Amino acid sequence: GAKRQATLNRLLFPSPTKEFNEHREAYGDTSQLSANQFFYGLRQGEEHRVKLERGVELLIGLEAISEPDERGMRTVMCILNGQLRPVLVRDRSIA
Amino acid sequence: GAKRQATLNRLLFPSPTKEFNEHREAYGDTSQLSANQFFYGLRQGEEHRVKLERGVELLIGLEAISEPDERGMRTVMCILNGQLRPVLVRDRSIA
Incomplete structure (x- = not known):
């Protein structure tokens, strides 16, 4: 199930999957956008x-x-x- | 009355009073604005x-x-x- 997939993602690359989880919480799902x-x-x-x-x-x-x-x-x-x-x-350019 | 004043304005300076009448028709009354x-x-x-x-x-x-x-x-x-x-x-700058 999705639990196993999440557990593999966290067990393989902790820091970037935690960043990805924070980003997905912040900005929903953006994988449907174009380049x-x-x-x-x-x-x-x-x-x-x-x-x-x-x-x-x-x-x-x-x-x-x-x-x-x-x-x-x-x-x-x-x-x-x-x-x-x-x-x-x-x-952020003008600070 | 105001008729005499308008008749004096048109009889003294025709072209600028006609411009003023067109401007007042176009943009209402703007004499209440500041500099x-x-x-x-x-x-x-x-x-x-x-x-x-x-x-x-x-x-x-x-x-x-x-x-x-x-x-x-x-x-x-x-x-x-x-x-x-x-x-x-x-x-009007970029035409």
Whole structure:
């Protein structure tokens, strides 16, 4: 079962499987993304389709990005299923 | 009355009063704005109060600006009375 598989994963490579478990807890399941979204990100004018389940698909796009405030925090306006969504993110470049 | 004032304005300086009439038709009444808003515009992080009538005031702010598409058109996300508003504008710099 899946228990044996998890026990093998932890018994073979402990540190990276623990990192993988933390990442999967944090950001759900991202193995369904493409290379372009996974490695680069979102661009403006481009719609992406991500398959969650059979008949359950998500349509993701970008709208705009604001310059950072006195903190290192920026706000990104995106589109999910045709609805606007603001997301607060940290820009590690300006510290 | 106001008719005499309009007739004097048109009889003294026709071309600029006609431009002023077109501008007032296009953009309502903007004589209540400050020098900073009138000459420069809107910046991010600041909130402006504009008085329309006695007890009727408007609170204006900025959220973000997107880079122009294949056209010369940009979308500016602003805040009016605490509500998000997208405005489509033309950037004459890139033609």
